[PDB]
Design a protein around this motif. Structure first.
Motif, mmCIF file in Angstrom:
data_model
loop_
_atom_site.group_PDB
_atom_site.id
_atom_site.type_symbol
_atom_site.label_atom_id
_atom_site.label_comp_id
_atom_site.label_asym_id
_atom_site.label_seq_id
_atom_site.Cartn_x
_atom_site.Cartn_y
_atom_site.Cartn_z
ATOM 1 N N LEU A 19 7.506 0.010 66.052
ATOM 2 C CA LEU A 19 8.675 -0.818 65.765
ATOM 3 C C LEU A 19 8.717 -1.228 64.300
ATOM 4 C CD1 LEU A 19 11.164 -2.442 66.582
ATOM 5 C CD2 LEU A 19 9.645 -4.280 67.307
ATOM 6 N N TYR A 31 14.956 -6.252 68.938
ATOM 7 C CA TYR A 31 13.676 -6.801 69.362
ATOM 8 C C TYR A 31 13.804 -8.311 69.494
ATOM 9 C CZ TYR A 31 12.898 -8.263 64.500
ATOM 10 O OH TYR A 31 13.008 -8.844 63.260
ATOM 11 N N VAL A 41 3.830 -8.199 71.762
ATOM 12 C CA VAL A 41 3.605 -8.376 73.193
ATOM 13 C C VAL A 41 4.733 -7.679 73.942
ATOM 14 C CG1 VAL A 41 2.238 -10.485 73.048
ATOM 15 C CG2 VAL A 41 4.736 -10.614 73.063
ATOM 16 N N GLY A 42 4.772 -7.844 75.262
ATOM 17 C CA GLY A 42 5.864 -7.306 76.049
ATOM 18 C C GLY A 42 6.663 -8.372 76.771
ATOM 19 N N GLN A 46 12.937 -5.145 74.759
ATOM 20 C CA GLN A 46 14.123 -4.859 73.963
ATOM 21 C C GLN A 46 13.956 -3.663 73.033
ATOM 22 O OE1 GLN A 46 17.777 -4.855 73.174
ATOM 23 N NE2 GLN A 46 17.068 -6.587 74.403
ATOM 24 N N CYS A 47 12.736 -3.377 72.579
ATOM 25 C CA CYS A 47 12.503 -2.339 71.580
ATOM 26 C C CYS A 47 12.353 -0.950 72.191
ATOM 27 C CB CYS A 47 11.275 -2.690 70.740
ATOM 28 S SG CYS A 47 9.702 -2.556 71.611
ATOM 29 N N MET A 64 8.023 1.300 74.659
ATOM 30 C CA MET A 64 8.304 0.179 73.774
ATOM 31 C C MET A 64 7.877 0.535 72.358
ATOM 32 S SD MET A 64 9.629 -2.171 75.732
ATOM 33 C CE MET A 64 10.288 -1.194 77.079
#
Ligand code: SF4
Ligand code: SF4
Ligand code: SF4
Ligand code: FES
Ligand code: FES
Ligand SMILES: [Ca+2]
Lengths: 905, 156, 147
Positions: A19, A31, A41-42, A46-47, A64
């Motif tokens: 990212l 993001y 983190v998760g 969004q990414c 991700m």
């Protein structure tokens, strides 16, 4: 390593996240839960991009970007059908239960959720069911709480706990009724809670000080400035509207103050919009306080200074380099006195000696986080300048980062790093007269008198190198912890020593220099940082001059009949009665200041100077780098009767009227040339920013955004005819939007970060070559200091132990963040945050006095018996008494002094 | 004005002995307080944070995360009827209507005597034995709507 | 009883291997059964799961190498080390070796739990061990694993 985005080759780093690799290339991936300074983190999803295995692949897999490594040979796609519609679904899910209150929200044009909802192209709604709500909390005078706006991306709790080390914020609740806040209602007691305003991508944590007198982001006139509240000199973006400064935001600089401010600099801007500030030159005859313009004030002041037999100028450590130099040219060099006490000036001079003559590298704020063992001697770092303390927290977490890197897990996933760490901390040894806020992460805290901390430092230096002077009288129970510190610092690859002038003793600086020299002797990469008192105290020390006491003696002796005090209260650096008597004895008193101080009464001429929001100037950091701050707005745009000129402008025109009997409203670059031509050690201040004749492709740089609203109705309440825009001849900036704030522009100083599609504070990543790193095209401010080839000598002066004496009390500073700054107490929002004026006593000392905690006690200093309520300090030592410096009636120079007649009132 | 008793503090320290971290013993400390006093009051969060060393925000997050850590005052007996799928096929709505008719409350509410607190449960783990409901560490299986007042009246 | 009878303590059967066993009763959440969320709940945090490929086998509870195994998984292995290996591979002619606690549940004639080898058809279990549907039910759907 190379990657393939949308069938296009890119050369990115292989050790960083995907990212941040894509965002460093100017590509747009939405993001929420990722921050460049907080890891990945998760908490959102969004990414999401689509990753393939080889070059010829159709199906792919949704991964991700913030959790995929940017290794060599990856084939990802951002703007295919599946990833785009999945990100649209994720913003739809986040906005499924989101309140319909954007126009009545504090974020508005600063909101990241708005930008990422528009970027994903989600406008239509098909969710027809009910929303979700939460109750709000009272988080204190600075942070407004609106929990309904939350999207649960966990960035606030991660920053406040992992990064900031605070113990207030947290996650509560369950699946969908999740909560982010305090367990009760109360003030966030961390010193970095103000960064939650811009850390939160939504309107949950907002600025209460900006909630009052609120305007949108596009209506703000911004400027790049330096925070004037302490010595760290964090780069800020003050933004104003309607003639008053409204909000200070973070300004990115990958060397000092990358992403985070402290609460003092974030919320201590209320003193520049006080209605009691001097706006016009005021001259008194008898009891008549008449108002002059600039020219009459200069003519009259030049007349009285010409008729005087000797002029003396008292500078300040809060004024800029240009203003202090302009005073130094208005008065002679032989009579020019720095407005600080003799002991404080001596501590400042030896700290400067250790800086530019100790042969030892002084790190910047960003690279403090890379050290391996921190020893803080005497300083309450978390309370004087807290940003160095936050960098110390990061340096402590560097050991967990090292242990994670030994297990070959990537550095951008902080969850695995904190899992591997598990309270594995780099050695932090803090010494203070009482408890600090760094004691939760410190390997050891030394609560002792200041001389005992100095002897501890001398013992550390002697045990690290036998050439250092030895200490007699060290107890073996303290010698064991001395040995613990010695083996902790000896095995460290990059040890860091922190001290400062706020400790109130010369010998703490001496011992810190001795420890640094002993670490440098054995081939370590030791660095030293010193936290000075005010914003430009180091610049005043570099400029030099006599103490305030010498100025006072020159006043009551009668040798000087004219005094020009530039931006100094004069009660913080000396006793009030002596200063009042010396100023009353002076036939001519001039006060060039922007704050209504106590000495302006019975001051024969008052010049309305300008603060950092209304002036241009240069200030030197505690590390020695010379940054410069720019004017935010013209004070004469609204209510044009006020002139409100720069301090160096006032003093230069006064000098010109003294010499040639005519005024000269000079330029900033002329004063910069005069400084770099007269003072050789200040020659580096013409490298921080270019001249006023600097343009990117022929045009200036805009102080305000292109969507600056209401230009033809802003001043319509007093004049329907729109006036001409204010002309800024001093600097590289224009007061209108007709400038340049492009992210891909060859400049180092950015007024505000805005990109198309990035209206949030997360538009700073477009202004950097790589995100989370240094700013593109360099960084503002040059170092101005080079490490000497050889170091200093071993300071043989080792003080004795602190023996308590009957009938006398040693005063110990406490230095609250919200109450130990002269410009911070005048802010109306801080007055609810400062503690009540108190005095700390030991349990044994209180038992000897017979006074219980909470009741009044009376103590006499300068023949004045004042009564303060006591409180019991467990960590304090016997024979000492504790005071909060900087407060009203309690000068910062009171540290290290004696006290008499502690009687119950 | 919460104050941990001696037995509670000894139990918390003994559970602290079993782990590498007192934070690991936070959940069992909350369960000890819940067992002793029926529920976890507001001062118990700060008490656990003081005896452990971890912040009170972490203790509050643990207390509000797990379902069977009650942060509201509950009755003397907590009825926990199974909300899952196998008990839905065997029929839990009949026994839920029977409980609501007998107690004259809703799930999540307690009776005006402070005696019973009706709550749903994720899963009892006894799916092969018909409808299931747990009262005060006592499971009950093969439930019928007509057997609810008999099963309820043997409790205090 | 095991720590009384010399097992489960220190110097087990004169080997010198020290192992001690605890029971950590959870406070109740469905997410706690996931191994990383089990680790987070065992550490007394909110039982949010963690992200792989940092696995519990390399960095789990308190950063140490752990492994999380089911009750059935840990209960088949004494039979393996007490009876044999090829015996364990030769109890079922399928590539899913071993026996599993199968069984139907939900409005059947005999809901229960029976240990059967892999490769047993679900119709066999339902119509033989579970007894099939009751008088009046037509068995319109089923799940292999519950829910
Ligand atoms: S309050 Fe803000 S930063 Fe915290 S989880 Fe919610 S949206 Fe994210
Ligand atoms: S936080 Fe953003 S999306 Fe939410 S109400 Fe405020 S402006 Fe709208
Ligand atoms: S650490 Fe000092 S310079 Fe930085 S924001 Fe705080 S008060 Fe301002
Ligand atoms: S930015 Fe949140 S999942 Fe990657
Ligand atoms: S479905 Fe109710 S006990 Fe499992
Ligand atoms: Ca100007």
């Amino acid at each position: 390593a190379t990657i393939h985005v949308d069938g296009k080759e890119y050369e990115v780093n292989g050790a960083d996240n995907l990212l941040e690799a894509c965002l460093s290339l100017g590509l747009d991936i939405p993001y929420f839960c990722w921050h460049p300074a907080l890891g990945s983190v998760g908490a959102c999803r969004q990414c999401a991009v689509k990753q393939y295995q080889n070059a010829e692949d159709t199906r792919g897999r949704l991964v991700m970007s913030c959790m995929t490594p940017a290794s060599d040979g990856t084939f990802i796609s951002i703007d295919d059908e599946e990833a785009k519609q999945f990100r649209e679904s994720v913003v739809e899910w986040l906005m499924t239960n989101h309140p319909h209150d954007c126009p009545v929200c504090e974020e508005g044009g600063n909101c990241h959720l708005q930008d990422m909802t528009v970027m994903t192209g989600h406008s239509f709604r098909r969710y027809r069911f009910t929303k979700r709500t939460h109750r709000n909390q009272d988080l204190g005078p600075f942070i407004s709480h609106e929990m309904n706006r939350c999207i649960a991306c966990y960035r606030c709790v991660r920053y406040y706990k992992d990064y900031a080390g605070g113990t207030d914020l947290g996650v509560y609740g369950a699946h969908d009724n999740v909560y982010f806040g305090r367990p009760e209602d109360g003030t966030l007691e961390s010193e970095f809670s103000g960064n939650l305003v811009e850390i939160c991508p939504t309107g949950v944590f907002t600025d209460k000080t900006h909630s009052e007198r609120y305007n949108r982001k596009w209506d703000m006139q911004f400027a790049p400035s330096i925070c004037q509240q302490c010595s760290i000199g964090c780069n800020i973006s003050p933004g104003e509207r309607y003639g008053e400064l409204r909000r200070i935001e973070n300004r990115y600089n990958g060397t000092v103050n990358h992403y985070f401010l402290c609460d003092r600099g974030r919320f201590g801007y209320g003193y520049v919009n006080l209605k009691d500030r001097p706006r016009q030159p005021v001259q008194r005859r008898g009891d008549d306080f008449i108002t002059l313009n600039a020219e009459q004030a200069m003519q009259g002041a030049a007349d009285i200074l010409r008729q005087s037999k000797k002029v003396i100028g008292i500078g300040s450590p809060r004024a800029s380099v240009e203003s202090n130099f302009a005073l130094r040219e208005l008065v002679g060099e032989e009579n020019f006195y720095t407005g600080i006490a003799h002991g404080e000036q001596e501590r400042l001079q030896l700290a400067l000696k250790v800086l530019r003559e100790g042969g030892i590298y002084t790190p910047a704020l960003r690279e403090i986080e890379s050290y391996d063992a921190v020893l803080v001697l005497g300083e309450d770092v978390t309370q004087t300048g807290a940003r160095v303390a936050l960098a110390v927290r990061q340096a402590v977490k560097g050991k967990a980062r090292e242990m994670a890197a030994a297990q070959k897990v990537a550095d951008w996933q902080i969850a695995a790093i904190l899992n591997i760490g598990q309270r594995a901390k780099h050695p932090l040894f803090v010494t203070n007269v009482d408890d600090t806020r760094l004691d939760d992460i410190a390997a050891w805290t030394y609560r002792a008198p200041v001389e005992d901390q100095a002897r501890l430092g001398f013992a550390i230096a002697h045990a690290l190198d036998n050439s250092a002077p030895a200490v007699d009288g060290i107890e073996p129970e303290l010698q064991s912890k001395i040995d613990v510190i010695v083996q902790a610092l000896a095995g460290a690859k990059k040890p860091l020593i922190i001290s400062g002038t706020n400790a109130g003793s010369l010998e703490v600086i001496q011992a810190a220099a001795n420890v640094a020299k002993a670490l440098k002797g054995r081939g370590a990469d030791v660095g030293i940082t010193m936290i000075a008192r005010s914003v430009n105290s180091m610049g005043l020390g570099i400029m030099g001059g006599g103490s305030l006491e010498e100025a006072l003696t020159e006043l009551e002796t009668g040798r000087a009949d004219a005094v020009v005090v530039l931006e100094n209260d004069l009660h913080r650096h000396a006793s009030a009665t002596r200063v009042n008597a010396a100023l009353a004895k002076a036939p001519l008193v001039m006060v060039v200041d922007h704050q209504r101080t106590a000495i302006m009464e019975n001051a024969h001429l008052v010049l309305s100077a300008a603060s950092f929001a209304e002036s241009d100037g240069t200030v030197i950091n505690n590390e020695g780098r010379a940054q410069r701050f720019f004017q935010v707005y013209d004070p004469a745009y609204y209510d044009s009767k006020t002139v409100m000129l720069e301090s160096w402008r006032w003093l230069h025109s006064l000098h010109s009227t003294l010499l040639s009997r005519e005024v000269d409203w000079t330029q900033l670059d002329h004063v910069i040339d005069a400084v770099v031509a007269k003072i050789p050690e200040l020659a580096g201040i013409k490298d921080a920013a270019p001249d006023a004749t600097f343009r990117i492709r022929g045009q200036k740089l805009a102080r305000e955004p292109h969507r600056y609203s209401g230009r033809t109705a802003m001043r319509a309440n007093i004049s329907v005819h729109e006036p001409r825009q204010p002309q800024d001849i001093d600097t590289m900036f224009t007061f209108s939007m007709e400038g340049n704030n492009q992210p891909t522009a060859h400049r180092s100083q950015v007024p505000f970060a805005w990109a198309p599609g990035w209206n949030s504070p997360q538009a700073w990543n477009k202004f950097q070559d790589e995100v989370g790193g240094k700013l593109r095209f360099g960084d503002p401010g040059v170092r101005l200091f080079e490490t000497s080839e050889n170091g200093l000598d071993y300071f043989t002066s080792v003080p004795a132990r602190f023996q308590p004496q009957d009938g006398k009390w040693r005063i110990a500073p406490y230095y609250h963040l919200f109450g130990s700054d002269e410009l911070s107490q005048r802010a109306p929002v801080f007055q609810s945050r400062m503690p009540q004026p108190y005095i700390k006593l030991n349990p044994a000392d209180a038992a000897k006095l017979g006074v219980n905690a909470g009741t009044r006690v009376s103590f006499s200093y300068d023949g004045n018996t004042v009564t303060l309520p006591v409180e019991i300090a467990e960590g304090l030592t016997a024979g000492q008494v504790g005071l909060p410096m900087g407060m009203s009636g309690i000068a910062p120079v009171l540290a290290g002094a004696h006290l008499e007649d502690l009687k119950e009132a | 004005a919460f104050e941990l008793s001696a037995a509670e503090r000894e139990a918390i320290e003994h559970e602290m002995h079993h782990y590498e971290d007192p934070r690991a013993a936070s959940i069992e400390a909350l369960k000890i307080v819940q067992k002793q006093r029926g529920w976890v009051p507001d001062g118990a969060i700060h008490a656990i944070a003081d005896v452990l060393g971890i912040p009170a925000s972490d203790v509050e997050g643990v207390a509000t995360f797990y379902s069977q850590i009650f942060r509201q005052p509950v009755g003397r007996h907590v009825i926990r009827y199974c909300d899952s799928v196998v008990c839905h096929i065997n029929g839990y709505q009949g026994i839920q209507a029977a409980l609501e008719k007998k107690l004259n409350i809703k799930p999540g509410q307690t009776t005006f005597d402070g005696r019973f607190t009706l709550l749903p449960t994720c899963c009892l783990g006894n799916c092969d034995k018909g409808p299931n409901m747990m009262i005060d560490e006592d499971t009950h299986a093969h439930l019928t709507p007509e057997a609810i007042p008999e099963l309820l009246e043997r409790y205090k | 009883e095991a720590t009384e009878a010399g097992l489960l303590g220190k110097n087990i059967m004169g080997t010198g291997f020290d192992f001690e066993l605890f029971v950590h009763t959870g406070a109740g959440r469905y997410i706690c059964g996931e191994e990383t969320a089990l680790i987070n709940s065992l550490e007394g945090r909110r039982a949010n799961p963690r992200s792989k490929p940092p696995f519990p086998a390399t960095s789990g509870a308190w950063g140490k190498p752990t492994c999380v195994n089911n009750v059935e998984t840990l209960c088949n292995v004494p039979a393996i080390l007490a009876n044999g290996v090829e015996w364990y591979q030769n109890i079922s002619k399928s590539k899913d070796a071993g026996t599993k606690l199968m069984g139907f549940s939900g409005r059947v004639k005999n809901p229960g739990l029976w240990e059967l080898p892999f490769g047993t058809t679900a119709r066999e279990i339902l119509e033989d061990y579970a007894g099939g549907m009751r008088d009046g039910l037509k068995f319109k759907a089923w799940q292999p694993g519950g829910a």
